[PDB]
Amino acid sequence: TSIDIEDIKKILPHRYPFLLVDKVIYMQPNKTIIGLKQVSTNEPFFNGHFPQKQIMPGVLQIEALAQLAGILCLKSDDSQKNNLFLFAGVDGVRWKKPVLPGDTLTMQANLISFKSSLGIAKLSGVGYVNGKVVINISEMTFALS
Amino acid sequence: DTSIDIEDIKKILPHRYPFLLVDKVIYMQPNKTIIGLKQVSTNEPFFNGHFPQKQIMPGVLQIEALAQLAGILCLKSDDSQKNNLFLFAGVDGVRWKKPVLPGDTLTMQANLISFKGIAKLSGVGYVNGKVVINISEMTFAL
Amino acid sequence: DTSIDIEDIKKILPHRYPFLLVDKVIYMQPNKTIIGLKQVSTNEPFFNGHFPQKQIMPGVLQIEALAQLAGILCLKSDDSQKNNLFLFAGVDGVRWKKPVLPGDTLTMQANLISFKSSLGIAKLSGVGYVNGKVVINISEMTFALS
Amino acid sequence: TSIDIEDIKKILPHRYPFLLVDKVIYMQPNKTIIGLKQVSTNEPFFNGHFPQKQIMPGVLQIEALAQLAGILCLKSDDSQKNNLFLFAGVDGVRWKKPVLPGDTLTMQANLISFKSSLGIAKLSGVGYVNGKVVINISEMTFAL
Amino acid sequence: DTSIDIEDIKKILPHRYPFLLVDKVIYMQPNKTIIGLKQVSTNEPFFNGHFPQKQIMPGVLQIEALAQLAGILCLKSDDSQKNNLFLFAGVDGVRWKKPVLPGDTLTMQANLISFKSSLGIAKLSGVGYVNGKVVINISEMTFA
Amino acid sequence: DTSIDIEDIKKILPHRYPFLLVDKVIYMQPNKTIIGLKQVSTNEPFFNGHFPQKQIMPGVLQIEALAQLAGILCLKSDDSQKNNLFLFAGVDGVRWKKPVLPGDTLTMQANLISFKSSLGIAKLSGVGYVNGKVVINISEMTFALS
Numbered sequence: 001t002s003i004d005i006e007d008i009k010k011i012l013p014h015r016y017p018f019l020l021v022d023k024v025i026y027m028q029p030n031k032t033i034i035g036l037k038q039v040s041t042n043e044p045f046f047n048g049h050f051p052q053k054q055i056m057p058g059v060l061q062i063e064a065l066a067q068l069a070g071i072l073c074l075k076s077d078d079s080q081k082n083n084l085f086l087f088a089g090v091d092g093v094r095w096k097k098p099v100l101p102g103d104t105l106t107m108q109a110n111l112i113s114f115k116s117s118l119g120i121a122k123l124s125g126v127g128y129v130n131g132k133v134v135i136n137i138s139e140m141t142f143a144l145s
Numbered sequence: 146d147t148s149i150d151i152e153d154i155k156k157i158l159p160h161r162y163p164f165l166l167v168d169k170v171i172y173m174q175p176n177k178t179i180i181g182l183k184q185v186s187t188n189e190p191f192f193n194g195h196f197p198q199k200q201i202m203p204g205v206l207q208i209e210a211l212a213q214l215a216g217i218l219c220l221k222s223d224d225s226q227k228n229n230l231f232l233f234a235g236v237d238g239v240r241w242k243k244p245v246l247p248g249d250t251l252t253m254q255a256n257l258i259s260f261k262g263i264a265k266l267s268g269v270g271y272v273n274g275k276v277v278i279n280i281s282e283m284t285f286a287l
Numbered sequence: 288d289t290s291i292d293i294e295d296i297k298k299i300l301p302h303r304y305p306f307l308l309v310d311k312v313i314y315m316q317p318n319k320t321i322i323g324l325k326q327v328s329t330n331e332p333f334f335n336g337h338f339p340q341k342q343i344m345p346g347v348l349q350i351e352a353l354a355q356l357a358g359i360l361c362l363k364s365d366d367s368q369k370n371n372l373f374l375f376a377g378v379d380g381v382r383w384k385k386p387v388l389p390g391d392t393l394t395m396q397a398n399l400i401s402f403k404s405s406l407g408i409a410k411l412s413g414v415g416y417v418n419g420k421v422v423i424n425i426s427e428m429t430f431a432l433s
Numbered sequence: 434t435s436i437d438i439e440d441i442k443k444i445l446p447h448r449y450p451f452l453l454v455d456k457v458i459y460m461q462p463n464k465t466i467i468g469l470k471q472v473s474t475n476e477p478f479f480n481g482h483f484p485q486k487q488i489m490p491g492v493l494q495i496e497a498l499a500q501l502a503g504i505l506c507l508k509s510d511d512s513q514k515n516n517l518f519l520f521a522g523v524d525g526v527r528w529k530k531p532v533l534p535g536d537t538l539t540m541q542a543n544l545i546s547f548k549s550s551l552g553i554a555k556l557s558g559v560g561y562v563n564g565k566v567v568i569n570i571s572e573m574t575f576a577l
Numbered sequence: 578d579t580s581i582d583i584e585d586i587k588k589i590l591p592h593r594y595p596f597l598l599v600d601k602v603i604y605m606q607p608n609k610t611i612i613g614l615k616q617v618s619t620n621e622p623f624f625n626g627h628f629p630q631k632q633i634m635p636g637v638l639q640i641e642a643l644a645q646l647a648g649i650l651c652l653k654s655d656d657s658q659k660n661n662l663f664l665f666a667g668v669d670g671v672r673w674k675k676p677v678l679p680g681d682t683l684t685m686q687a688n689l690i691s692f693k694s695s696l697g698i699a700k701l702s703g704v705g706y707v708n709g710k711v712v713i714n715i716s717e718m719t720f721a
Numbered sequence: 722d723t724s725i726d727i728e729d730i731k732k733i734l735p736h737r738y739p740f741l742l743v744d745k746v747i748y749m750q751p752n753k754t755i756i757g758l759k760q761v762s763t764n765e766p767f768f769n770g771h772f773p774q775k776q777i778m779p780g781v782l783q784i785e786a787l788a789q790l791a792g793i794l795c796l797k798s799d800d801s802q803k804n805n806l807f808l809f810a811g812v813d814g815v816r817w818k819k820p821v822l823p824g825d826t827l828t829m830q831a832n833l834i835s836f837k838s839s840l841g842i843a844k845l846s847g848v849g850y851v852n853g854k855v856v857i858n859i860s861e862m863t864f865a866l867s
């Protein structure tokens with residue numbers, strides 16, 4: 001069930017300058033989510049990372065997947081009417097290639113386990129630019145309090 | 146031919162944040178045509194103001210994006226005049242067809258018509274092969 | 288000759304920072320004309336980028352300022368369509384004569400040409416001045432309302 | 434004389450978002466300076482002061498006069514080739530009227546005493562909107 | 578635990594980003610005294626402009642910070658007047674001793690002098706410290 | 722004395738606003754350990770978006786902060802490779818215990834595990850505290866030099 005940005009803002013509480021999901025292109029509740037982040041020079045972090053060379057900070061690639069993963073969780077089960085999800089842990093992150101201004105960051109997050117009893121969700125994540133892997137995440141752990 | 150990435154764009158244009166609106170130049174033929182792109186993300190400073198309830202890339206910023214791409218072409222076509230500060234002198238026949246939204250890739254093409262430093266150029270911008278903006282004539286001054 | 292102060296402009300237009308470019312409306316005649324102003328200060332976020340070595344108000348933002356003023360006139364001339372999100376559909380015959388600089392007061396006048404309850408097609412012309420001298424001309428702004 | 438924004442930046446080290454003099458319209462070395470700050474909604478402080486009502490922060494009115502004062506000092510005597518001035522004290526500030534988006538803040542600073550390259554300058558300041566007084570400052574004290 | 582944290586500060590003050598200059602209120606006594614802090618980081622929007630070559634927290638923003646703290650004390654001391662928009666009406670006897678730099682914790686204390694059941698005028702004094710050392714003094718802040 | 726603050730940090734790291742997340746280095750021992758701090762204020766540009774209703778310092782930026790402090794250590798431990806652009810190659814075993822809030826002082830310690838200046842491969846561990854209490858743990862940060 002594809003998606004436009006206004007509806008993302010209804011699901012996630014993130015705003016500027018920390019909303020890092022531009023569009024959700026495919027979603028299957030309780031299973032997988034595919035979305036994208038457009039990487040433009042006209043973004044506030046770029047001036048600091050770095051003046052002489054513009055490279056999207058790896059941590060913000062984590063944040064982007066984590067937000068996409070967080071959308072999946074909130075659509076998969078919103079019985080807990082709390083959209084404030086906090087990152088509890090992340091594991092096995094590997095950055096292969098620099099993400100640069102001009103790139104389309106295509107992202108996929110996959111739900112591993114949900115314990116709606118605690119609020120404990122675990123997800124994996126991969127990000128691509130031009131079909132080539134730029135970031136891998138073995139395991140994102142989330143906790144809505 | 147060979148890509149002009151963002152670090153090299155900054156060496157041609159004087160524009161900086163928050164008013165550099167060309168992310169990448171993908172093709173250029175001096176004195177003829179230029180193709181580039183602007184990635185449209187929600188994480189841009191203008192989107193909060195246009196509009197809170199619905200994020201739509203301002204039409205005037207699409208003009209600015211094409212104009213900067215057109216400005217690159219001029220400066221690489223003839224840099225005998227060593228001045229990179231090129232002002233907009235006139236624009237004509239602009240038509241916006243479709244809203245440009247967060248998540249889109251704005252693909253842009255500018256075409257040089259006449260160079261004398263009065264340069265005239267035409268411009269088109271696409272999202273998904275669909276035309277979003279047309280510009281008959283951009284006029285620029287040295 | 289009812290001025291309009293920034294707070295009431297915000298009630299009409301949906302634009303916010305950093306893209307609201309009308310500071311005050313000084314005169315308005317529904318279905319006819321509107322005069323307002325935009326104060327041009329160095330303390331505006333666009334100036335760092337346009338340009339580092341020389342601050343000049345982006346021509347396009349002069350277009351946007353007139354367009355927003357024009358869009359006020361439209362929404363006060365006829366608000367039966369309770370939609371304040373107006374989109375720019377076309378612009379024609381823009382000519383920039385003089386650079387607009389930090390310190391200037393941009394005085395703006397927009398004039399309604401045609402309005403159609405068609406699908407919300409409004410056409411307007413615009414002129415911007417600094418110190419009584421013309422800095423921007425616009426023959427025709429075309430507005431559509433989603 | 435006049436002094437543009439490009440030339441202002443040559444004198445003052447202040448940059449965005451803390452340069453609060455747009456134009457210097459009259460200046461007499463060692464005596465008086467008149468300049469202006471254009472107050473627009475399109476300034477970064479206005480979102481925070483305040484969401485429900487945009488009012489230019491008084492402290493920034495102080496800054497603006499102080500920056501204008503600082504220009505006068507640096508053009509009055511630049512033997513000390515240091516443009517980094519610091520505010521050492523301010524006294525007798527009174528805000529009469531709110532300064533709002535749309536206003537032109539016209540500012541005048543008057544040099545009282547200058548003590549060489551000890552570096553102590555004292556100046557007074559007034560700001561106006563529409564010929565009406567918005568801010569008074571009895572004494573700004575600078576370290577050179 | 579007579580304190581107030583960021584979220585509850587925002588319930589009291591109308592100030593938002595980039596002009597909210599109180600991070601935490603650590604002690605408060607209605608109608609008497611208030612102690613709070615402002616964390617000073619390089620990651621604040623004003624530092625780019627003040628100054629590119631040397632980051633120093635603008636003195637006027639040290640005035641603002643204390644005044645905001647002072648403003649909290651007023652609003653918690655007497656909220657019968659259900660208006661949280663306090664304007665600075667005057668300030669007097671401000672003296673900056675030492676530069677406040679990125680990395681510092683600005684600890685602030687404001688003390689209520691007079692509150693008028695006649696006017697709507699409050700007068701307060703302020704001191705700001707970094708590492709127990711005095712950085713800013715304010716004899717008198719006047720609020721309406 | 723071992724005191725390094727923000728002007729000297731900027732000489733070591735290439736990071737600028739809004740992405741320099743180390744305010745002060747309070748202790749450093751080349752090739753071994755580094756201790757520094759980040760002051761957490763409401764007057765930071767990320768807080769508006771994370772989150773409007775509740776200001777909490779994004780976990781990822783806690784990572785970045787420790788990584789930058791780790792990066793200082795590397796560049797002061799061995800600068801034979803005259804390149805200050807360090808990229809994050811991997812991170813492992815991150816756990817966030819407690820929310821970091823406006824008003825907090827984030828105290829940070831990074832410890833060098835292995836350096837192979839041959840390649841440009843450095844591994845480091847990191848811990849962040851607020852009020853002596855652990856807020857973030859990082860088993861392993863891996864950094865490449867390009």
Ligand SMILES: Oc1ccc(Cl)cc1Oc1ccc(Cl)c2cccnc12
Pocket residue numbers: 208209212213216217230231232233234285337343344345346347348383385386
């Ligand atoms: O926007 C502008 C409008 C009017 C002027 Cl006097 C200058 C402007 O800024 C520009 C500078 C340089 C280039 Cl190459 C531009 C290209 C297109 C549009 N504006 C440009």
Ligand SMILES: Oc1ccc(Cl)cc1Oc1ccc(Cl)c2cccnc12
Pocket residue numbers: 482488489490491492493528530531640641642643644645647648649662663664665666
């Ligand atoms: O700065 C200001 C100067 C003059 C005015 Cl008319 C208003 C100002 O903004 C403020 C509003 C409320 C409070 Cl409690 C303030 C506290 C300190 C500084 N400014 C404050």
Ligand SMILES: Oc1ccc(Cl)cc1Oc1ccc(Cl)c2cccnc12
Pocket residue numbers: 495496498499500502503504517518519520627633634635636637638673676
């Ligand atoms: O605000 C400031 C307060 C304290 C310091 Cl240490 C510096 C400040 O910024 C300024 C720099 C230079 C000049 Cl000439 C100023 C003039 C007035 C106010 N602030 C000024």
